Enzyme design. Structure first.
Site, PDB file in Angstrom:
ATOM      1  N   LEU A 192       0.824  -1.211   0.000  1.00 43.72           N
ATOM      2  CA  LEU A 192       0.000   0.000   0.000  1.00 43.72           C
ATOM      3  C   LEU A 192       0.855   1.257   0.000  1.00 43.72           C
ATOM      4  CD1 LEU A 192      -2.898  -1.040   2.445  1.00 43.72           C
ATOM      5  CD2 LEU A 192      -2.949  -0.800  -0.060  1.00 43.72           C
ATOM      6  N   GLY A 193       2.056   1.151   0.549  1.00 44.42           N
ATOM      7  CA  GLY A 193       2.921   2.306   0.622  1.00 44.42           C
ATOM      8  C   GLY A 193       4.175   1.969   1.387  1.00 44.42           C
ATOM      9  N   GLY A 247       7.935   3.780   3.228  1.00 45.69           N
ATOM     10  CA  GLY A 247       8.912   4.807   3.532  1.00 45.69           C
ATOM     11  C   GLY A 247      10.287   4.265   3.185  1.00 45.69           C
ATOM     12  N   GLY A 254       9.926   1.698   6.898  1.00 43.97           N
ATOM     13  CA  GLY A 254       8.633   1.061   7.083  1.00 43.97           C
ATOM     14  C   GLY A 254       7.868   0.821   5.794  1.00 43.97           C
ATOM     15  N   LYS A 255       7.005  -0.185   5.797  1.00 43.72           N
ATOM     16  CA  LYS A 255       6.096  -0.416   4.681  1.00 43.72           C
ATOM     17  C   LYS A 255       4.715  -0.781   5.211  1.00 43.72           C
ATOM     18  CE  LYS A 255       6.617  -4.175   2.182  1.00 43.72           C
ATOM     19  NZ  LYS A 255       7.210  -5.272   1.353  1.00 43.72           N
ATOM     20  N   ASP A 304       4.335  15.153   9.053  1.00 41.81           N
ATOM     21  CA  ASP A 304       4.309  14.480   7.751  1.00 41.81           C
ATOM     22  C   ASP A 304       2.951  14.609   7.075  1.00 41.81           C
ATOM     23  OD1 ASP A 304       5.626  12.989   5.738  1.00 41.81           O
ATOM     24  OD2 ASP A 304       4.872  11.085   6.520  1.00 41.81           O
TER      25      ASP A 304
HETATM   26  C1  LIG Z   1      -2.267   4.192  -0.184  1.00 38.19           C
HETATM   27  C2  LIG Z   1      -2.991   3.674   1.050  1.00 38.19           C
HETATM   28  N1  LIG Z   1      -4.148   3.107   1.006  1.00 38.19           N
HETATM   29  C3  LIG Z   1      -4.542   2.758   2.241  1.00 38.19           C
HETATM   30  C4  LIG Z   1      -5.693   2.124   2.704  1.00 38.19           C
HETATM   31  N2  LIG Z   1      -5.848   1.902   3.979  1.00 38.19           N
HETATM   32  C5  LIG Z   1      -4.939   2.239   4.897  1.00 38.19           C
HETATM   33  N3  LIG Z   1      -4.913   2.085   6.272  1.00 38.19           N
HETATM   34  C6  LIG Z   1      -3.749   2.599   6.762  1.00 38.19           C
HETATM   35  C7  LIG Z   1      -3.006   3.090   5.754  1.00 38.19           C
HETATM   36  C8  LIG Z   1      -3.745   2.881   4.505  1.00 38.19           C
HETATM   37  C9  LIG Z   1      -3.527   3.160   3.136  1.00 38.19           C
HETATM   38  N4  LIG Z   1      -2.547   3.732   2.340  1.00 38.19           N
HETATM   39  C10 LIG Z   1      -1.260   4.354   2.720  1.00 38.19           C
HETATM   40  C11 LIG Z   1      -1.533   5.512   3.682  1.00 38.19           C
HETATM   41  C12 LIG Z   1      -0.221   6.247   3.959  1.00 38.19           C
HETATM   42  N5  LIG Z   1       0.794   5.328   4.503  1.00 38.19           N
HETATM   43  C13 LIG Z   1       1.042   4.169   3.642  1.00 38.19           C
HETATM   44  C14 LIG Z   1      -0.254   3.398   3.376  1.00 38.19           C
END
Ligand SMILES: Cc1nc2cnc3[nH]ccc3c2n1C1CCNCC1
Length: 292
Positions: free
Chosen positions: A24-25, A27, A30-31, A141
């Site tokens: 999902l994302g 750093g 962290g991931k 952030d």
């Molecule tokens: C891109 C993204 N979609 C998400 C859906 N649910 C989530 N629940 C928690 C995060 C989170 C999601 N993220 C990112 C948000 C920013 N940090 C990386 C993941």
């Protein structure tokens, strides 16, 4: 040993049932991944967002303790942790929001999301931030990519990896490692002296508001727009150039179709002196006046 009853803790997620779906994302340390917690083994289990370290344990641990204790409709919900019998290691479990961050959702839904709805997002972001500010935290952030979409009517602040407590009687947190700074979202005092005030989050909200207004389009991103302003080929001299531009009083331009009264709210987030910046409270009032 006569062992007592094995009670169920709804916040304890067993590793063996946490099944990876996709990233999902990420750093640098962290991931976050989308997983299904699927103890029945049939792919009907709950989808959750799982943050872990890349192969900083104490940091993730403090992020978990911060999120676990935050309770607000515009702040993503802690669900639990995953720990191993061995120990040391830990993953944070959050609710998963299928629409993703403003970065995924906004470019796909331009047609649905008009100015009133953007302004309501802006209010909700400010309320989460204000709630956070009241617990004596600076986020550090804030950016569209850290704002999740719960529904067309509702957003939530969705990551806290840099969040720090401000000491009692102090007004700012002084940061040590700044290598990975989102410099195009950072207020001058963060860039020059590396101090983070609540007013520093207000500055970052200012740019997050800009992203929201430009629907997170990559060619209108704060990075792209700033690099165009100052030169995209200055390498190690970029932050200095950036600081000058701000000292010179330049700011991101008004997004197309952004009415000047919204832009002017944005400007007050970007007063050069921390003390002169509007507050989240004022912002909420200003936004609410436009929605009547
Ligand atoms: C891109 C993204 N979609 C998400 C859906 N649910 C989530 N629940 C928690 C995060 C989170 C999601 N993220 C990112 C948000 C920013 N940090 C990386 C993941």
């Amino acid at each position: 040993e006569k062992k007592p009853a094995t009670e169920v803790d709804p916040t304890h997620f067993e590793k063996r049932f946490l099944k990876r779906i996709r990233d999902l994302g990420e750093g640098h340390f962290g991931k976050v991944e989308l997983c299904r917690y699927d103890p029945e083994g049939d792919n009907t289990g709950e989808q959750v967002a799982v943050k872990s370290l890349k192969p900083h344990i104490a940091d993730l641990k403090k992020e978990i303790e911060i999120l676990r204790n935050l309770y607000h409709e515009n702040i993503v919900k802690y669900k639990g942790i995953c720990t191993e019998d061995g120990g040391n290691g830990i993953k944070l479990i959050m609710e998963f929001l299928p629409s993703g961050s403003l970065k995924e959702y906004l470019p796909k839904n331009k047609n649905k999301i008009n100015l009133k709805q953007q302004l309501k997002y802006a209010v909700q972001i400010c309320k989460g931030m204000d709630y956070l500010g009241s617990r004596q935290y600076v986020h550090r952030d804030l950016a569209a990519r850290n704002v999740l979409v719960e529904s067309e009517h509702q957003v939530k602040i969705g990551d806290f990896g840099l969040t720090k407590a401000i000491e009692t009687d102090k007004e700012y947190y002084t940061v040590k490692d700044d290598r990975d700074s989102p410099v195009f979202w950072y207020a001058p005092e963060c860039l020059m002296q590396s101090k983070f005030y609540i007013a520093s989050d207000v500055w970052s909200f200012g740019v997050t508001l800009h992203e929201l207004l430009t629907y997170c389009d990559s060619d209108s991103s704060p990075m792209a727009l700033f690099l165009k302003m100052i030169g995209p080929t200055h390498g190690q001299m970029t932050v200095t150039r950036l600081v000058n531009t701000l000292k010179e009083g330049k700011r991101l331009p008004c997004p197309p179709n952004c009415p000047d009264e919204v832009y002017q709210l944005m400007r007050k987030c970007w007063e050069f002196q921390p003390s002169n910046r509007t507050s989240f409270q004022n912002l909420i009032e200003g936004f609410e006046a436009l929605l009547k």
